[PDB]
Structure 1
Amino acid sequence: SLVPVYIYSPEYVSMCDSLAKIPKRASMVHSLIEAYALHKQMRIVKPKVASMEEMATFHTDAYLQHLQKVSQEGDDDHPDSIEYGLGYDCPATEGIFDYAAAIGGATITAAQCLIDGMCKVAINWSGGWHHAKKDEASGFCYLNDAVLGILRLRRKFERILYVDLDLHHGDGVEDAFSFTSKVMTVSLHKFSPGFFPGTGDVSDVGLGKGRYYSVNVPIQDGIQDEKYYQICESVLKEVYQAFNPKAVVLQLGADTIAGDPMCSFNMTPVGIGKCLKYILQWQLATLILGGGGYNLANTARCWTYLTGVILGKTLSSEIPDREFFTAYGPDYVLEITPSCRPDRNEPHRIQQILNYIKGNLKHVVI
């Protein structure tokens, strides 16, 4: 068990390609990975589809059955749907229940691989839908696969660390485990008035027995690789020493990358890659997930690069993908150049945030 598990099948990718907000992204991601032949260095595992019972380990039957109902024909005019979070952000597209069950099952399959000791790293680039609530779709997320995966991992591993490097706050995962000390959630994210989903200030630390077992790092526009890694490393260092996790779930949404229409952070995959490396050197069972990422070519660039990092491989700069070659224009290279725009993060504020978190984590004692 030294070779990473790569969750993939043509049917799975085809289903993931059907998501309204990210059409064909799953195909572009796999295609680039395939073109670099990285899948040949991984153990390819076909994802099982999640059963109703498996999904009900987190979601309520009422939500699941409603989702299943409107999905059968794609009824986007059902009275109850709005209260279930279906609407503009999360349309009731036809087959959405099967799509959600596939993504959920994929993450669960990855978790099962980790449990069975088939690998130390399992990857589901089409997972990471961190906004989904117990009975509410949210932020393009219909099912919280990350939560399902964490719950599966808990069958074998005592403490789970969830690290969320998406541009957005991993609120759905944080909320799901807000009450417990057995799962710690760490989220680095943009935090600004009005910016979705609005939660996750540094003062948000969890509830009850879960107090101080939620960690949030509010960040402003324009952050680049060096500063981001400095922040991420300091937080993760403190978290690791205090929490001593037995397994890790890592969400690597590429909407932080320069050129993403979200136009907030100014990162390159190299910076995120450094964070990933730091986590990998803990040598723990690690479940790798995707997430946001709306510059499709750049998202493919990012996750392909990260797959290379996981494999310890250095990748050729020239894009080898023929099928989607034109999408990588005009320069057709793997590297991504940061935009020209200011880092809005004041060093004093960042330091305040870091100090606050360090104070919070002192309460965390295993």
Structure 2
Amino acid sequence: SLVPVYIYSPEYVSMCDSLAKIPKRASMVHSLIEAYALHKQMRIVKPKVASMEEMATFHTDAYLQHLQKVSQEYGLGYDCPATEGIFDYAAAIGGATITAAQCLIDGMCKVAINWSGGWHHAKKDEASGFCYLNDAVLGILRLRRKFERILYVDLDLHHGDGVEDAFSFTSKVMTVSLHKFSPGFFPGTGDVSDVGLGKGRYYSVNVPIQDGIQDEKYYQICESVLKEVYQAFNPKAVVLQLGADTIAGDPMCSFNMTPVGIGKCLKYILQWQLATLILGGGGYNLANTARCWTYLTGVILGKTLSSEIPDHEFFTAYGPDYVLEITPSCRPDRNEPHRIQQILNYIKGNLK
């Protein structure tokens, strides 16, 4: 077994480290997890590289081939620069989430972790927001070999548009996303009015949130909507993305969460006791993202972690404080009690 599965292999971590816009985060994340000796308490499973056929269960051959070519418009460039070996990078992530999926389809595993996955923005034929391959989607598509109702819960700061669009017309998968929704804020979509299309209408729930949201309030919103969604929908399996770009101190500077808030949310989903695929995502303050995910790793394990940071390779990276906890800034919570209730009521009606 009941020990969660931890997708890892030095080759995978190093391949993940080569991501241009987020260098070394994989190692840092794994290193801190290892430092608290959190691993060796999970079932370590090596990642399998995704094949062309597998990745194409969503992406088009046109896009896959092209990507494989430059690794030697499709959304490539500035935000998504096709650096050397990027195709390999993508295939390893995708492969990694698909193997976490298989780990769940089979037994002896109620939770499968791939902190390096979670790129929800990738379209079937286009890279977007640092996302080259949509692993979350590939995991969901794998999970559906055995589960008729999958619940996708996206807690990244950004809207999970890629995964949502992928299933907007089906009621097999239900995508729920809590994100910042403001005029010029990427990807600029996902208002509460967004509920899906055709046969998928009401199977896409979006929770537009504003800057400054803190642990408490965030959790009340989350539990409120999740509880409602667990009722109407009878999820057999669950895919959860935990982008840490919501954590106080992120360069993104929008939400004001700490891993503990996001923690209560995790605990809430873990208590349904369903097959759960854990993914990472955003998180541009490399040190905090590591603190966030190793802590959440502890929450998956239940074992409370030592407040002081354990000596390891990146010990220095832990600011001046050197503690596991993260303190929110003194920024205001631009979320009025009335609009949040209004949003909740809208979706609450929608759910049928």
**TM class by smaller structure:** over 0.9
The alpha-carbon deviation at position 321 of structure 1 amounts to: 3.4
8 Å CA contact retained: 2:291, 2:324? yes
Q: Matches of 2:87 and 2:305 in 1, distance apart?
A: 37
Q: Matches of 1:211 and 1:68 in 2, distance apart?
A: 35
The alpha-carbon deviation at position 87 of structure 1 amounts to: 0.9
Which deviations, in whole Å up to 9, do the C-alpha atoms of 1:321-347 show, x marking residues without a partner?
A: 321011102010000011110000011
Q: Matches of 1:149 and 1:287 in 2, distance apart?
A: 8
Q: Matches of 2:319 and 2:345 in 1, distance apart?
A: 43
The alpha-carbon deviation at position 47 of structure 1 amounts to: 0.3
The residue that corresponds to 2:291 in the other structure is 301
| Percent identity over paired residues | 100
The alpha-carbon deviation at position 67 of structure 1 amounts to: 0.1
The alpha-carbon deviation at position 258 of structure 1 amounts to: 0.1
Q: Matches of 1:93 and 1:120 in 2, distance apart?
A: 36
The alpha-carbon deviation at position 51 of structure 1 amounts to: 0.2
The alpha-carbon deviation at position 277 of structure 1 amounts to: 0.1
Q: Matches of 2:256 and 2:270 in 1, distance apart?
A: 23
Aligned partner of residue 176 in structure 2, secondary structure: strand
User: Where do 5+ consecutive residues of structure 1 fail to align?
Assistant: 73-82
Which deviations, in whole Å up to 9, do the C-alpha atoms of 1:252-307 show, x marking residues without a partner?
A: 00000000000000000000000000000000000000000000000000000000
8 Å CA contact retained: 1:184, 1:213? yes
Equivalent residue pairs, number: 352
User: Where do 5+ consecutive residues of structure 2 fail to align?
Assistant: none
8 Å CA contact retained: 2:195, 2:205? yes
Aligned partner of residue 40 in structure 2, secondary structure: helix
The residue that corresponds to 1:239 in the other structure is 229
Instruction: Please list every run of at least 4 consecutive aligned residues from structure 1 whose deviation after the TM superposition is greater than 4 angstroms.
Output: none
Which deviations, in whole Å up to 9, do the C-alpha atoms of 1:208-261 show, x marking residues without a partner?
A: 000000000000000000000000000000000100100000000000000000
Which deviations, in whole Å up to 9, do the C-alpha atoms of 1:26-78 show, x marking residues without a partner?
A: 00000000000010100000000000000000000000000000111xxxxxx
TM-score (norm 1): 0.96
The residue that corresponds to 1:348 in the other structure is 338
Aligned partner of residue 19 in structure 2, secondary structure: coil
Which deviations, in whole Å up to 9, do the C-alpha atoms of 1:93-151 show, x marking residues without a partner?
A: 00000000000000000000000113000000000000000000000000000000000
Which deviations, in whole Å up to 9, do the C-alpha atoms of 1:192-223 show, x marking residues without a partner?
A: 00100001000000000000000000000000
8 Å CA contact retained: 1:103, 1:145? yes
The residue that corresponds to 1:76 in the other structure is none
8 Å CA contact retained: 1:31, 1:321? no
8 Å CA contact retained: 1:162, 1:248? yes
8 Å CA contact retained: 2:32, 2:312? no
Q: Matches of 2:93 and 2:140 in 1, distance apart?
A: 14
Aligned partner of residue 199 in structure 2, secondary structure: helix
The residue that corresponds to 2:220 in the other structure is 230
Q: Matches of 1:321 and 1:267 in 2, distance apart?
A: 26
Q: Matches of 1:252 and 1:303 in 2, distance apart?
A: 8
Q: Matches of 1:329 and 1:223 in 2, distance apart?
A: 24
Aligned partner of residue 339 in structure 2, secondary structure: helix
Which deviations, in whole Å up to 9, do the C-alpha atoms of 1:145-189 show, x marking residues without a partner?
A: 000000000000110000000000000000000010000000000
